[PDB]
C-alpha cells in the first residue's frame, strides 16, 4: 500500500532526526530481518562462510553498508549496488557552543552543515539531538548515546519593519565542574542532554548535536498527491533503497542464490564526499573486498567483480516547478507520482555511457515501472571511477531540495521502493543481455 | 500561577480559528455563553437596551466585533474604558477568479498577498484553505454564510526553487454544477471541496472569501519553555488577551450595580491602513457608544463629555528585543519576554506631547502589581484618538519576527496581557480621576 | 436598441461642458426640468422638505452636487441607495497671476497642472479656455458668478520642440480697466476676452477660476464603430451614466408611493486626493442624508441604522485591456469594451474581506440582465465606506488611456452604464434584503 508506506516514511523522518538516528534505525530494522552485524574493527574471515549470508556494518555511526552474499556467488556475477547518502543539511552545535548572555537571552553558537543556511531556516521550530559520548563513573570505557528533544523545540533562528539562536536556575555543582565539556557549553544545555541520555553531566565526554525542524511531515494537497517533510535529501532514496533490500531479502535464501547485493549509505555528501565516511572513503569497496576474501579461499579477481557490476547512485533530482519554467529543459524534467528519475548531465560521468540508461530503461519495462529524465551529485562519479563499475545516477525527484521542508509525490516513496526492489531481482538477468558492452 | 497556560488555550484558539471570520465567530460564541446579548447593527437598539444597561456585542461584516458592558448608573462624566485591537492578519487570499489552467499537469490557483508584499518566510510552509462561503440553498431567496476550514489538511504550498514566482501547487462538471455563479471562476475540484466542507451543493455557492494560512499548530518552546511559537500573533494575541480580560471582568459585574461603560472593539483591515468600514476609521466603537447612550436613557447624552472622560487602550504589538540585531533597538527602550505589557512611545506620532496617558498606565500597573515596558522606535490609536477626542495610549504585548508567518513571544505573555487588561477594566476610572482636569 | 446612442448625447455633453462648473450647471438644468427642487445648503431645510418627501438637489462650491429622491414612506431600516462619483478631471489651470511678459513678441500665460504632473499627451493639442468668473456689476454689492467658454476657439497650446518647458503660446488699458481687482494679475487682452464672453466689463471682474482643456469634440470610432474617443472621460463618464440613470428612474417614481431614499452625489477634487470640503471627505452625501431625515419627519432618525442598511456604489473608472501591454494586466481579471460594468477588486484596499458587496452586484446584474466584469490590479469608496459605515462597492465603466487628454471606451458603454445604474436604483433594496444580517 502506497498510503501506508508514505506514513512509515513520515514517521521515520520524524523519529530519526539526525544521521546517527537514521543509521541506528536501519541497524535495528536489519537486525529484525535477520541481517548479522559485522564490526569493521574485526577480521571477517570467521564471521563469513561459504554459506554467505545477510550482513551489515557501520562506520562512524553514520556510514552503513548492508549486503546479501549468495553461497553460489562468483566474480563474474558482480555486485548489484544502490549507493545513497543519509546526511542532510543542518545547523550543528559548535564544539564550544557557549554564548554570553545577550540582554537576558540565552543563545548558542552554531554552524551550518552542507551549505550556507538560507532564509527558509528562519522562524522554524528547531529541536536538538544527536550523539553524546560519555564515560560512566568508575569505568574507562567511553560509550555512545543518542538524544532527541522532539517534540520540544529548544530554539529558533529569528527573522527580523526596520543568525544566532535564542534557547532561553541553579549554579554549577562541584561534580558538574569535573566534566570535560563544562567549559564549552552552557550548563543548562549540559543538564538537559545529560537528562535525556540518563547520565550525569560529569560523565559527558563529547557531543555531536544538530538543530533540526521538529515539524512532522504530512500528506498534502487537495487530492493528497503531495508529501511535505524535512530532510528529504536524501533520506527519501536511502529509505526506499533499504526497504527495497529488506523486501527483496524476504524471498531470498543465500544457499540457493548466486547474487551479491548491497545498499551502502554514506555521510558527508553535502560536504563533497571526501571523508572516511563519505563515498570516497571506500566502505563499499571494502565490504566487497573483505567479503569476497572471507567467503572463499579461491583468490577472487576484484577487477572482474566490478567489471560485471551495476551501481545505482541514488540521489534526488529536481521535480518540475511550474512557477519557474525557465529553469527547466523541455522533455527533461520529472513530475510527481510517476516513477524514478534518471539524471543525465552532458558534462557528467554518464555523458559518454548509453548502456546504463538502456539497462534502467530495460529494467523498468520488465518490472512495470516508468522512468523519467532530468537534464540541466558526488557519489556517482566517485564510485564509478573508484570501482571501474558502470554507474547510473538515479533518484526520486523532489521540489525545493535544500529547503528545510521539501515536497515530493505522496506515491513516490512507494514507487521508489517498487523500482529498487525490481532492480535487485532483475539487474543481473538484464545486464546479461548487453554482454561485453 | 500554574494557570499562566492559558497559553495552550491561546494556541488552540489560533489553531482552530485561522481566518478573521473564525476569530469573530469564536468570540461571539464565548461572549454569548457569558450572557452577552447580540445586537444587530441593522436594527435600532432603543428597545433592546434599557435602564438596567447590560452586556452586549455587535458585529460588522463578520470581521469587526464590539463587545460592551453598560452600567445602569453610567453617565457621560464617567466616560468609556476602551480596548481597541485588530483581528486581521497577514495572509494569502484566493483571488476572485482563482482559476489557472494546468502547468504540465500541476493544478494551481491565482492568489494575492493581504497586508504586505509577502516574504520568503511564506515559502515551503503547509497551507490550509479556509474562510467564508456565501450560499443560497435551492428554492430559497436567503443568502447565508458558512465557515470552512481544511485544517489539518494542507491543500497547498508556495514552493521555493532549489504573482509570477509566488504561485501554488494544489471528474467532469455536472449540469447542476455549471448552474453555479462561481463555475467559471474557480476550478471545479476546489469548488467541490469547499462545498463538501460547508455541507452544501456546488450549485448553491454564491461567493467566497478564502485565505491560505499556515496549518502548523503553535507550540510552547525553548529549553526552559520560555517561548510560544505560533502563526498570526499580530494582532490576535492582544485581541485574545483583551477579550478574555473583559470576560473575566464581566464575571464579577452585575450591570445594575455599575456606573461604568466598558468595551473591547476588534477591527479588520489594520494591515491595510484601517480606512475601511470594518477598520478603525469605520467608527464601530463610536457607533456603539452613541447608540448605547441614546437607547439607554431618555435624557440627552453629551458625547464630547463622554470622550473627554474616556481612556482608549489602542492595543497593538511591539517588537521584542532580537538579540541577533542589537543596533536597530534603542537602549533602555526595548521590551523583553515574560515581563509585561509594552508601551509604544514614538517621538513623532500621536503620543508625543501626551505624558498623562503614560503616567496613567504606570499608575494602573503599580496598583495591580503589573510591570510595564517601554519601546521607542494606519495605526488605530491615532485614528481613534482623533475620531473621539479621547485620550489614547498605544501599547501591547511584544513579539519577535512580527509579520512572519510564524512569530514568537513569551510563554507567560498571554497571561500577563490578560492580567494587565483585567486590571485596566477594574481600575482605570479610579486612577484617571486623580489626574482631574488634566 | 438603436438608442445606445446616447453616446452622441454623451459626446455633446463633454463638448458643451468643459469645466466642472459647466458639468454641475448642466446637471442642475437637467434635474430641475425633471422637477427636482434646488435646496440651498446655506439655508435650513425643515420647511422645504415635508411628509411627502420629494425630489431635490443641492450644490456646494458649484463643483459638488447631490441629487436625491426621498420617499414619503422612507424609514431608517430602508437605508439609502447611493451612487458616488467625481466630476473633476485632469486639466491645466490658469495661475492666480497668469501674467507673463512677452518672449520675442509671443504672448504667454502662467499655468499649473491640476491632478497630475502632466503628460507629453498634452503637447500639440488645441486648448480652449473656460470656467468661472466672479464679478460685481457697477453700483452693486453682490458678487455673482458667470460661466465662460471659448469653444470652439483654441486660444492656446503647449508646443513640443521639434513650468519651464510646459508653457503656452496665446490696446492700452482704460482708466476703468485699471480699476479692476485683476488688473495687474492677468494680461489686459485675456481679461478683455473673458469679460466679453461673460457680458460684463473688465472693471467688474473680481476673480476667476479658468481651465485650459482640449476643444476637440469626441467621436464614435473604429471600423465597426465599437469605440468612443473623447476628452475628460475620468470620471465624467460614470457621473453622466449615474445621473441619467437616476433621472430615468425618477420618471416612474411618485415620491408619495415610495419608501426608498436614493441619491447620486458628484464630488470635486478626486484627482487631488479628496480631502477638500467639495471632495468625498467633505461629507456632502452624509450632510444631505442627515438634513433630509431631520427635516422630513418629527420622529428622531437613527443614522447608524440608516447606513448599516445602505449600499454605496463608488463609481470610478477601471482599465480596459490594452492589447499592446498584456503583461500589466492580470489574466481573468481585465475588462473588455461593450460588455458591461467593471467591478474593481484589490487584494489590499477597502473591498478585500467584503465578499457580500460583490455578491450583491452580481445578483443585481443577474436580475436586470446586465453583465459584470472583474478587474484585480484618495479614492472615494474607502472614504465614503469609513465615513458612513455603509457597505460600499467600487466599480465603474472601464476605459483605455485613462488620464490621457483623450481617452477611449466602448461605444455601447455609456448605455450599458446607464442600464446597470438604472437597475441598481430599481432593485438594490430588494436584493440586499436576502443577505439579511450579513
Nearest CA-CA distance, residue B315 and chain C, Å: 20
B404 contacts in chain A (CB < 8 Å)? 122-123, 159
B206 closest CB neighbour out of C305, C359, C389 = C359
Cα separations in angstroms, C268 against B105, B362, C82, C295: 52, 47, 17, 26
Chain C residue with minimal CA distance to B89? Answer: C353
What are the start-end ranges of the H helices in C369-404?
380-388
Q: Which of C421, C114, C103, C393 is nearest to C239 (CA)?
A: C421
B326 contacts in chain A (CB < 8 Å)? 102-103
DSSP 3-state of A332? coil
Nearest CA-CA distance, residue B329 and chain A, Å: 9
The answer to whether residue B143 neighbours chain A at the CB level (below 8 Å) is no
The answer to whether residue B266 neighbours chain A at the CB level (below 8 Å) is no
The answer to whether residue A228 neighbours chain B at the CB level (below 8 Å) is yes
Report the alpha-carbon distance of residue A166 to residue A155 in Å, rounded. 6
Q: Which of B84, B27, B78 is nearest to B381 (CA)?
A: B84
Q: Which of A388, C285, A49, C332 is nearest to B98 (CA)?
A: C332
The answer to whether residue B287 neighbours chain C at the CB level (below 8 Å) is yes
Report the alpha-carbon distance of residue B44 to residue C303 in Å, rounded. 10
Q: Domain residues of chain A, as ranges?
A: 1-88+216-437, 89-215
B interface test, pick of C77, C347, C380, C383 with most B CB neighbours within 10 Å: C347
Report the alpha-carbon distance of residue B389 to residue B383 in Å, rounded. 10
Give the full edge-to-edge strand order of the sheet including C407-410: C219-221, C227-230, C407-410
Q: Which of B206, B211, B208, B202 is nearest to B156 (CA)?
A: B211
Task: List the CATH code of the domain at A89-215.
Answer: 2.30.250.10
Q: Which residues contact C77 (CB under 8 A, 6 or more apart)?
A: B42, B43, B44, C305, C309
A positions 322-381 inside 8 Å of B (CB)? 322-325, 327, 333, 335
Look at C353 and B279 and tell me if their CB atoms are within 8 Å. Answer: no
A353 in a labelled binding site? no
C with A: touching (≥3 Cβ pairs within 8 Å): no
Angle, in degrees to the nearest 10, between helices C20-32 and C7-16? 130
B272 closest CB neighbour out of C77, C349, C356 = C349
Nearest CA-CA distance, residue C81 and chain B, Å: 15
Q: Which of A97, A98, A102, A38 is nearest to A69 (CA)?
A: A38
A positions 21-80 inside 8 Å of B (CB)? none
Q: Which of A291, A313, A213, A246 is nearest to A32 (CA)?
A: A246
Structure resolution in Å? Answer: 2.5
- The CATH number of B1-89+217-438, from 2.60.120.620, 3.40.109.10, 3.30.930.10, 3.40.630.10, is 3.40.630.10
Helix, strand, coil percent content, chain A, rounded in steps of 5: 30, 25, 45
Q: How many other β-carbons are positioned within 10 Å of the β-carbon of residue B359?
A: 14
C271 in a labelled binding site? yes
Give the full edge-to-edge strand order of the sheet including B37-38: B37-38, B54-60, B64-70, B261-267, B81-86, B311-315, B391-396, B341-345, B372-376
**Residue A145 and residue A208 in contact, taking contact as beta carbons nearer than 8 Å:** no
Cα separations in angstroms, B418 against B27, B225, B421: 15, 19, 5
Name the superfamily (CATH) of residues A1-88+216-437.
Answer: Zn peptidases (3.40.630.10)
**Residue C380 and residue C86 in contact, taking contact as beta carbons nearer than 8 Å:** yes
Could you tell me the three cell numbers for C325? 501591454
B186 in a labelled binding site? no
Angle, in degrees to the nearest 10, between helices C413-433 and C233-251? 60
Nearest CA-CA distance, residue B377 and chain A, Å: 9
Nearest CA-CA distance, residue B137 and chain C, Å: 12
Cα separations in angstroms, B395 against B97, B408, B420, C15: 39, 18, 11, 56
Breaks (C-N over 2.5 A) in chain B follow: 162, 170, 377
Q: Which of C209, C277, C205 is nearest to C59 (CA)?
A: C277
- The CATH number of B90-216, from 3.40.50.2000, 2.60.40.10, 3.40.50.10490, 2.30.250.10, is 2.30.250.10
Look at B159 and A323 and tell me if their CB atoms are within 8 Å. Answer: yes
Phi and psi at B365, nearest 5°, equal: -60, -45
Chain B residue with minimal CA distance to C430? Answer: B141
Report the alpha-carbon distance of residue B15 to residue B12 in Å, rounded. 5
A167 contacts in chain B (CB < 8 Å)? 222-223
Report the alpha-carbon distance of residue C257 to residue B160 in Å, rounded. 63
The answer to whether residue B143 neighbours chain C at the CB level (below 8 Å) is yes
Amino acid at each position: 500500500n502506497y498510503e501506508d508506506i508514505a506514513q512509515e516514511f513520515i514517521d521515520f523522518i520524524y523519529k530519526n532526526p539526525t544521521t546517527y538516528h537514521v543509521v541506528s534505525f536501519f541497524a535495528e530494522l536489519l537486525d529484525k530481518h535477520n541481517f548479522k552485524y559485522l564490526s569493521e574493527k574485526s577480521n571477517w574471515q570467521d564471521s563469513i562462510g561459504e554459506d554467505g549470508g545477510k550482513f551489515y556494518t557501520i562506520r562512524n555511526g553514520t556510514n552503513l553498508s548492508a549486503f546479501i552474499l549468495g553461497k553460489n556467488w562468483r566474480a563474474e556475477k558482480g555486485v548489484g549496488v544502490i549507493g545513497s547518502h543519509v546526511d542532510a543539511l543542518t545547523v550543528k552545535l559548535k564544539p564550544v557552543s557557549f554564548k554570553d548572555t545577550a540582554e537576558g537571552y540565552g543563545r548558542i553558537a552554531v554552524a551550518p552543515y552542507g551549505g550556507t543556511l538560507n532564509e527558509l531556516w528562519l522562524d522554524r521550530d528547531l529541536g536538538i539531538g544527536g550523539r553524546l559520548l560519555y564515560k560512566k563513573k568508575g569505568t574507562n570505557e567511553i560509550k555512545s548515546a543518542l538524544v532527541d528533544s522532539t517534540p520540544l523545540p529548544v530554539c529558533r533562528i529569528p527573522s527580523l519593519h526596520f543568525q544566532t539562536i535564542p534557547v532561553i536556575n541553579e549554579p554549577p555543582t562541584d561534580d558538574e565542574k569535573k566534566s570535560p565539556l563544562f567549559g564549552k557549553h552552557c550548563i543548562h544545555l549540559l543538564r538537559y542532554v545529560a537528562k535525556l541520555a540518563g547520565v550525569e553531566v560529569s560523565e559527558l565526554i563529547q557531543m555531536d548535536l544538530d538543530l533540526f525542524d521538529v515539524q512532522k511531515g504530512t500528506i498534502g494537497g487537495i487530492g493528497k498527491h503531495f508529501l511535505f517533510a524535512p530532510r528529504l535529501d536524501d533520506r527519501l532514496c536511502s529509505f526506499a533503497a533499504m526497504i527495497a533490500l529488506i523486501c527483496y531479502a524476504k524471498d531470498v535464501n543465500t544457499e540457493e542464490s548466486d547474487l551479491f547485493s548491497t545498499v551502502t549509505l554514506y555521510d558527508n555528501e553535502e560536504i563533497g564526499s571526501l571523508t572516511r565516511q563519505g563515498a570516497k572513503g571506500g566502505l563499499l569497496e571494502s565490504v566487497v573486498e573483505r567479503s569476497s576474501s572471507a567467503f572463499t579461499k579461491k583468490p577472487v579477481d576484484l577487477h572482474t567483480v566490478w567489471a560485471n557490476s551495476i551501481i545505482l547512485s541514488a540521489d534526488v533530482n529536481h521535480l518540475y516547478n511550474p512557477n519557474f519554467p525557465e529553469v527547466y529543459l523541455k522533455n527533461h524534467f520529472p513530475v510527481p507520482n510517476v516513477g524514478i528519475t534518471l539524471s543525465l548531465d552532458p558534462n557528467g560521468h554518464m555523458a559518454t555511457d548509453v548502456v546504463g540508461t538502456a539497462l534502467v530503461e530495460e529494467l523498468a519495462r520488465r518490472n512495470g515501472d516508468k522512468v523519467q529524465y532530468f537534464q540541466i551529485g558526488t557519489i556517482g562519479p566517485s564510485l564509478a571511477s573508484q570501482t571501474g563499475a558502470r554507474t547510473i545516477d538515479l533518484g526520486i525527484a523532489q521540489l525545493s531540495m535544500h529547503s528545510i521542508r521539501a515536497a515530493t509525490g505522496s506515491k513516490d516513496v512507494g514507487l521508489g521502493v517498487k523500482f529498487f526492489n525490481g532492480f535487485f531481482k532483475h539487474w543481473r538477468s538484464v545486464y546479461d543481455e548487453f554482454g561485453e558492452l
